[PDB]
Ligand binder design. Sequence first.
Ligand SMILES: *[C@@H]1O[C@H](CO)[C@@H](O)[C@H](O)[C@H]1NC(C)=O
Lengths: 49, 50
Amino acid sequence: KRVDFCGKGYHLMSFPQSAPHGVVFLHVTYVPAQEKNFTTAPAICHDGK
Amino acid sequence: EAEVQIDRLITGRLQSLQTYVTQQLIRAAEIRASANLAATKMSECVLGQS
Ligand SMILES: *[C@@H]1O[C@H](CO)[C@@H](O)[C@H](O)[C@H]1NC(C)=O
């Protein structure tokens, strides 16, 4: 859950691979896109509640 | 005897330079560790919530 520890975005999973003298991690990340703009409101009161 | 005198001077100054370089290396390693910790703090406690 720690941000930007492994990957760039929201972390899903990782796969390890060997190297001559090291390790290589393949991180899978989820990134939003195609945004839209809307009008918000904190709370809605009906019948005085 | 001038070769002997300059040899003594050279070896003394070389010893001093070696000591200075070693001290600088140790200080650089410590600073690098501290800055890595600071970078982790910047990445975690600012761009999100801990
Ligand atoms: C939504 O409308 C605002 C108002 O001009 C605009 O600034 C914003 O860019 C719009 N959203 C997107 C995704 O373009």
